[PDB]
Scaffold this active site. Sequence first.
Site, PDB file in Angstrom:
ATOM      1  N   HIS A   1       0.792  -1.237   0.000  1.00 54.41           N
ATOM      2  CA  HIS A   1       0.000   0.000   0.000  1.00 54.41           C
ATOM      3  C   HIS A   1       0.837   1.307   0.000  1.00 54.41           C
ATOM      4  O   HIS A   1       0.789   2.108   0.929  1.00 54.41           O
ATOM      5  CB  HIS A   1      -1.002  -0.023   1.142  1.00 54.41           C
ATOM      6  CG  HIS A   1      -2.106  -1.017   0.939  1.00 54.41           C
ATOM      7  ND1 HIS A   1      -2.157  -2.197   1.656  1.00 54.41           N
ATOM      8  CD2 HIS A   1      -3.173  -0.970   0.112  1.00 54.41           C
ATOM      9  CE1 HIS A   1      -3.248  -2.825   1.252  1.00 54.41           C
ATOM     10  NE2 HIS A   1      -3.879  -2.139   0.310  1.00 54.41           N
ATOM     11  N   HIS A   3       1.285   1.504  -5.854  1.00 53.55           N
ATOM     12  CA  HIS A   3      -0.019   0.830  -5.912  1.00 53.55           C
ATOM     13  C   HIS A   3      -1.088   1.857  -6.380  1.00 53.55           C
ATOM     14  O   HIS A   3      -1.879   1.542  -7.275  1.00 53.55           O
ATOM     15  CB  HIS A   3      -0.441   0.275  -4.541  1.00 53.55           C
ATOM     16  CG  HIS A   3      -1.909  -0.072  -4.452  1.00 53.55           C
ATOM     17  ND1 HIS A   3      -2.475  -1.034  -5.273  1.00 53.55           N
ATOM     18  CD2 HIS A   3      -2.869   0.424  -3.630  1.00 53.55           C
ATOM     19  CE1 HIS A   3      -3.759  -1.110  -4.917  1.00 53.55           C
ATOM     20  NE2 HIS A   3      -4.045  -0.240  -3.938  1.00 53.55           N
ATOM     21  N   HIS A  28      -7.239   6.933  -2.953  1.00 47.43           N
ATOM     22  CA  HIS A  28      -7.949   5.846  -2.290  1.00 47.43           C
ATOM     23  C   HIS A  28      -7.209   5.138  -1.149  1.00 47.43           C
ATOM     24  O   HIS A  28      -7.914   4.612  -0.305  1.00 47.43           O
ATOM     25  CB  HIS A  28      -8.530   4.818  -3.289  1.00 47.43           C
ATOM     26  CG  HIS A  28      -7.599   3.686  -3.614  1.00 47.43           C
ATOM     27  ND1 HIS A  28      -6.598   3.835  -4.539  1.00 47.43           N
ATOM     28  CD2 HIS A  28      -7.527   2.443  -3.078  1.00 47.43           C
ATOM     29  CE1 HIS A  28      -5.947   2.674  -4.560  1.00 47.43           C
ATOM     30  NE2 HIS A  28      -6.461   1.819  -3.677  1.00 47.43           N
ATOM     31  N   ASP A  29      -5.867   5.106  -1.102  1.00 45.23           N
ATOM     32  CA  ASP A  29      -5.155   4.457   0.026  1.00 45.23           C
ATOM     33  C   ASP A  29      -4.231   5.424   0.770  1.00 45.23           C
ATOM     34  O   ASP A  29      -3.286   4.979   1.422  1.00 45.23           O
ATOM     35  CB  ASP A  29      -4.351   3.212  -0.418  1.00 45.23           C
ATOM     36  CG  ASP A  29      -5.154   1.928  -0.537  1.00 45.23           C
ATOM     37  OD1 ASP A  29      -6.088   1.719   0.275  1.00 45.23           O
ATOM     38  OD2 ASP A  29      -4.860   1.146  -1.431  1.00 45.23           O
ATOM     39  N   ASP A  61      -8.815  -1.299  -8.108  1.00 47.39           N
ATOM     40  CA  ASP A  61      -8.073  -1.700  -6.909  1.00 47.39           C
ATOM     41  C   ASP A  61      -7.404  -3.075  -7.065  1.00 47.39           C
ATOM     42  O   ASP A  61      -6.294  -3.273  -6.574  1.00 47.39           O
ATOM     43  CB  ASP A  61      -8.987  -1.725  -5.687  1.00 47.39           C
ATOM     44  CG  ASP A  61      -8.375  -1.233  -4.382  1.00 47.39           C
ATOM     45  OD1 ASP A  61      -7.120  -1.119  -4.306  1.00 47.39           O
ATOM     46  OD2 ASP A  61      -9.145  -0.953  -3.448  1.00 47.39           O
TER      47      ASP A  61
HETATM   48  F1  LIG Z   1     -12.614  -4.251  -2.110  1.00 48.88           F
HETATM   49  C1  LIG Z   1     -11.685  -4.676  -2.979  1.00 48.88           C
HETATM   50  F2  LIG Z   1     -11.526  -3.682  -3.848  1.00 48.88           F
HETATM   51  F3  LIG Z   1     -12.226  -5.668  -3.694  1.00 48.88           F
HETATM   52  C2  LIG Z   1     -10.407  -5.067  -2.306  1.00 48.88           C
HETATM   53  C3  LIG Z   1     -10.205  -6.367  -1.851  1.00 48.88           C
HETATM   54  C4  LIG Z   1      -9.032  -6.713  -1.193  1.00 48.88           C
HETATM   55  C5  LIG Z   1      -8.030  -5.771  -0.978  1.00 48.88           C
HETATM   56  C6  LIG Z   1      -6.765  -6.127  -0.218  1.00 48.88           C
HETATM   57  N1  LIG Z   1      -6.651  -7.556   0.096  1.00 48.88           N
HETATM   58  C7  LIG Z   1      -6.123  -8.563  -0.642  1.00 48.88           C
HETATM   59  N2  LIG Z   1      -6.031  -9.767  -0.054  1.00 48.88           N
HETATM   60  C8  LIG Z   1      -5.412 -10.715  -0.734  1.00 48.88           C
HETATM   61 CL1  LIG Z   1      -5.399 -12.265   0.024  1.00 48.88          CL
HETATM   62  N3  LIG Z   1      -4.839 -10.673  -1.920  1.00 48.88           N
HETATM   63  C9  LIG Z   1      -4.918  -9.508  -2.580  1.00 48.88           C
HETATM   64  N4  LIG Z   1      -4.524  -9.098  -3.800  1.00 48.88           N
HETATM   65  N5  LIG Z   1      -4.871  -7.806  -4.066  1.00 48.88           N
HETATM   66  C10 LIG Z   1      -5.501  -7.369  -2.992  1.00 48.88           C
HETATM   67  C11 LIG Z   1      -5.603  -8.332  -1.962  1.00 48.88           C
HETATM   68  C12 LIG Z   1      -5.478  -5.340  -0.371  1.00 48.88           C
HETATM   69  C13 LIG Z   1      -6.313  -5.147   0.847  1.00 48.88           C
HETATM   70  C14 LIG Z   1      -8.232  -4.476  -1.452  1.00 48.88           C
HETATM   71  C15 LIG Z   1      -9.404  -4.128  -2.098  1.00 48.88           C
HETATM   72 MG   LIG Z   2      -7.606   0.520   0.607  1.00 47.91          MG
HETATM   73 ZN   LIG Z   3      -5.865   0.048  -2.914  1.00 49.55          ZN
END
Ligand SMILES: FC(F)(F)c1ccc(C2(Nc3nc(Cl)nc4[nH]ncc34)CC2)cc1
Ligand SMILES: [Mg+2]
Ligand SMILES: [Zn+2]
Length: 343
Positions: free
Chosen positions: A83, A87, A123-124, A235
Amino acid sequence: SLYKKAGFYTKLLHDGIQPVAAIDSNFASFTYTPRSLPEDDTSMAILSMLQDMNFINNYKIDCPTLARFCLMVKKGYRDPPYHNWMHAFSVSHFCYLLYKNLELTNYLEDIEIFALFISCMCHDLDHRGTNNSFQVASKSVLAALYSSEGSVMERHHFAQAIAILNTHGCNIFDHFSRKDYQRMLDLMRDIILATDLAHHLRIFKDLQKMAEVGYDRNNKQHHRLLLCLLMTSCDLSDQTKGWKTTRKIAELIYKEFFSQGDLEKAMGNRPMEMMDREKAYIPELQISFMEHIAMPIYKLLQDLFPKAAELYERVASNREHWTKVSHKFTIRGLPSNNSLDFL
Ligand SMILES: FC(F)(F)c1ccc(C2(Nc3nc(Cl)nc4[nH]ncc34)CC2)cc1
Ligand SMILES: [Mg+2]
Ligand SMILES: [Zn+2]
């Protein structure tokens, strides 16, 4: 878990606005990898994308103000493994790709597309490399301010975007009418809050209904739902690239998640399995994440926009890759060197 903030332009003024083809002949393609662009060239690229979508001329944005705003946004990110500013830059580039490849002007108003892009950049903002649950458990200042209302980090990211706009010389919306200025603030709030996975889980049934019933350009709620889906697609856009990108991004996500888990253990608390380097099995975690989160998001985008079919197929392909590499990845957590290059 210590992630620093850099603080508390003339090059950008001289030639910060460049034609996008001069950056890369493939810059407007879904095959472009924005993370390949040097960090020092990202502010110039943001201006170039805004110029290419004609937002600078159409909204009469003052270039010096836009240049200071972009540099403030960039300085507003800390340096956790995932983050960080790179990103936010890549999320913003995906928003530009959706505009260039899907003809968004036929589904949304120009002001909504403008808000989507600016929101992607913000956004972050000031992310600490920790999730919402951590803010609550650590009884942080951010949890004291927003836990009772939900989406602690997302409310903070929006509050940081507003503070940038209120900084002298950075207000890119200064000349907007009171009504249009407020509309920008409201759109940015809703778009940033849509980045909370818990919010996506809550509105899924309605997004899956909208795709089933077909998009209605005169339904104001359909515009709100589309903006939410488009923001989550931006995202998670690292999932739509080649296998080398998805593998590297998984390495960054878990380096960040495992540091949070080590911090919770030091506080005397048991972290979530996916945050525990002694329990987490990354290929299995990525397969569930791809299956339950990313794949349904890109399938919804394909249902609304036929040209987005390649994005879903690329995401399905990267999910199939995790199954194949799971034979060669036989350990919990990450190797001693924190790298997945061995795959
Ligand atoms: F809301 C949404 F936009 F869909 C969103 C869903 C997850 C996430 C985050 N979590 C993740 N967890 C895992 Cl296990 N792998 C990943 N790969 N890219 C992201 C992510 C980064 C916090 C952000 C936004
Ligand atoms: Mg975020
Ligand atoms: Zn993000």
